[PDB]
């Protein structure tokens, strides 16, 4: 192996010497403690290594050993129901070795080598195998895990182990040329996994939030970004998406954020129920955790590890949802590494190649036909944390060029506790047109008409919001005060949603459609009553308004009976009115 | 009504715009002098290779 | 152990000096610098290489020379000697007593930079703290294990609020039955760039309360060297962690004017010509602030707890300044004082709308405090927002054009601001605060209270103001 000594130490960057022959982006082991590093620059006899661990206490002259391989992850059975470090190390196995503190230099296997897995072969001797084919199946927490061929392996099968129980590293299939295939394989995190074709997204990705599912939909295989200042609600929105979405496997990447938010997931999830099966919610979730006070350079690796795991689960035929807790921390890690490299910053200290990395990260999402002929998709939701809520910063502007949806948060709505605080004037979605045929036959034949009818009401209310604030609400005619009151009803009773309520935290599509229908019927009846010459105050004091306000707290069971009674009551009250 | 509107609404927004534009220009100037500070050091390091 | 000295100084400029043959100095070590007059200065190694090593000095470099100065190693990692006898002492911010008593005898030596807590090893903070302030207890409640800064102004009385919070904080175990007795808090006080006037007030308040016998004070006055301002919070947090997680204490940490800490960091970052940030601050300020904030919390299997109340001043009341902006991204909330409320004589001038607490939702509810807590809080927030909007509308149009419902909202806002927020030095309990909150909610019709279920309405409604 190529072996050298340390020449200069400065923060998270270490320069070695005597490393002639080392390759770019290979993994090195630095110091007597074996800290993990990566080559990013070669210069004559020297090499530039960034360390993913704390470099305090090192001395000049300690050996450096190159492993000759890039950063890779172990892909195989047993990743579910786990929590991992930024370089794929199980934290629950680090705890039993180091206590309550995370010390450097700990080496653990990513996948458990002790557990026995039930093996069921599918191939037989003499068969030809290519990349991405299925060799066999292994049971898991309600899922069926498929042992895939590595993407670069071709040949003919010589022998197959019969059915039984084996560990992950016992060879089950041996090829005709002597290649041995195990239950797991390693893939470099910086390379995208191959596919056959990419398809057009045509099915919705249900989040359970009314404003996101109705007004700004995102399709199965698209991308979205949710910028917002501090206290807006990015984390509650992402954890609700983890809890209630219809994705088969959910990957959560806590890149550079609070550690209490990671303990909340570890405590709450093993008790909650999976929406689409009877098992616990944690059995379908993979956590990658790298908090703020953990080493800076490890923030970059966590994103790639998470996206590679999500791509691996895509190849098995599942639908995967990937949530990045914050990408601004990844941008800051890149900025710090570039500062150590003495590169020339472009803007705000950021390196000039930020937009290339962000583009390469968001590209990996999409709906594909896998190498095995099956069907899978990955959808990515990434949060952005602009400084001072300035949406013109480079990170936000580089993100908006690539994403298909843009959910903009506002601090003004969060001040008055109008959560989820989505600004409906600045947000947009580009997947609305493609999903209309699905809505027409899975929800109702007139759903887009209702959606447009509410969009126009919101637009008219926003238009009158330029007049009312300085002239006076009573100077308007009743034909506009009615619009103001209906806009208030829509804002408070439909768009608003409580993520901490027993019932309101989840909302199906048909319940939202019913609420939309009730609001529009009330509006039409109120307009007819206004044309009958009735004062608006007798309409605002009508008791049927309380039915709409309490509607969103009605459970999914009671709603089909509540809806009919409310619909009858609206017409009865507006006919009994003068 | 016009006096109160001009006092309470129009002026503070204009003043906030002034502050925001001033901050942006000052920050750009700081970014621009950083490059000159690097380039002078590179010039000084260039003409020292063999005097 | 034998000592080693290096005499090959080659370059001195500002805070940095270069040592030529220092090959065996560990990165991050602490050295002692001695000149010809016998004076001793401290320093830390910040870059070590084959050709030389770079050392920054903890104070000014006046008097140094290349002929007679020698650099001697002390330890490879900066460590502090901790003990149980440090309760009731005073220190200068670099570990030396000021009170004139003999130095303590260490039990252990611990690194001042600490270690990250394993997220698996943590547990959810759940014990509610009754502080005695209605704007905090009801609407921004504090939980054991929370970091909750106070966003002060230039001339606002944040120090008095911090002293009152430290004087009255209690856990109220009778509302949950998960214990008994009256187990008091230990207090760790760290001051960075404080002046004599505020230091005197803090010292007299602590001696009047009698809590000085169970407190540790780290004091770095405003005329002390600026590089000592960096080290001061780290040792205080080291002491707090040691006490809480090795002797089952419940400690409370108060950091005063961390804006001074941020300018102290900016000075060194400018000296090291590293890449700046939004307003000249270094680009790594988020990580440095995270290494301070994230040392609080609670640990599964252990009885101790750490709580932090930092104090910082918003420059020119600008919430988008980099210091409050980066503080808000890390801590679990904030308390913001309002200058408009302070002008009209309201004490404490806590502003309800920009204030926030993220750990409310697991510290209150059924089985702890009362079950109507959260719905009352939400209704109060909504009604106060509507009242503020109506009051802003009135200033343009006038009171003569107001609908009677908007008049009710305006009267609710003017009664809320006058009776709920303004309390003086009064020690209000949680039940009294909820009684006052329900008294204020009765000013509105029952149809307005959409945030509260009909179960609680009627059980509490229609009561009038009884506090005189
Ligand atoms: N959908 C929601 N329902 C109720 N409260 C919410 C919702 N979204 C956000 N919040 C409130 O926002 C606060 C913190 O938001 P957070 O997720 O920390 O935003 P960020 O992570 O961007 O700072 C929480 O205390 C919570 O009460
Ligand atoms: Mg967050």
Short mmCIF file of C-alpha atoms in Angstrom, two decimals, chain B residues 5-50:
data_model
loop_
_atom_site.label_atom_id
_atom_site.label_comp_id
_atom_site.label_asym_id
_atom_site.label_seq_id
_atom_site.Cartn_x
_atom_site.Cartn_y
_atom_site.Cartn_z
CA UNK B 5 -51.15 56.68 5.92
CA UNK B 6 -48.03 58.53 4.75
CA UNK B 7 -46.63 58.60 8.28
CA UNK B 8 -47.35 54.98 9.20
CA UNK B 9 -46.99 52.93 5.98
CA UNK B 10 -45.02 54.62 3.19
CA UNK B 11 -41.98 55.92 5.10
CA UNK B 12 -40.89 52.77 7.04
CA UNK B 13 -40.91 50.59 3.91
CA UNK B 14 -38.77 53.12 2.05
CA UNK B 15 -36.35 53.29 4.98
CA UNK B 16 -36.09 49.49 5.14
CA UNK B 17 -35.33 49.46 1.41
CA UNK B 18 -32.56 52.02 2.02
CA UNK B 19 -31.05 49.84 4.75
CA UNK B 20 -31.21 46.66 2.65
CA UNK B 21 -29.59 48.24 -0.42
CA UNK B 22 -26.87 49.83 1.73
CA UNK B 23 -26.05 46.48 3.36
CA UNK B 24 -25.87 44.70 -0.01
CA UNK B 25 -23.51 47.29 -1.50
CA UNK B 26 -21.23 47.31 1.56
CA UNK B 27 -21.03 43.50 1.57
CA UNK B 28 -20.11 43.47 -2.13
CA UNK B 29 -17.35 46.01 -1.46
CA UNK B 30 -15.93 43.79 1.30
CA UNK B 31 -15.93 40.76 -1.01
CA UNK B 32 -14.13 42.85 -3.63
CA UNK B 33 -11.33 44.09 -1.35
CA UNK B 34 -10.68 40.53 -0.12
CA UNK B 35 -9.54 39.52 -3.63
CA UNK B 36 -7.12 42.45 -3.82
CA UNK B 37 -5.69 41.47 -0.44
CA UNK B 38 -5.06 37.96 -1.79
CA UNK B 39 -3.58 39.19 -5.08
CA UNK B 40 -1.05 41.50 -3.40
CA UNK B 41 0.20 38.56 -1.34
CA UNK B 42 0.48 36.42 -4.47
CA UNK B 43 2.50 39.18 -6.16
CA UNK B 44 4.81 39.35 -3.14
CA UNK B 45 5.22 35.56 -3.16
CA UNK B 46 5.97 35.48 -6.90
CA UNK B 47 9.07 37.70 -6.86
CA UNK B 48 10.86 35.73 -4.13
CA UNK B 49 11.57 32.44 -5.92
CA UNK B 50 15.27 33.19 -6.43
#
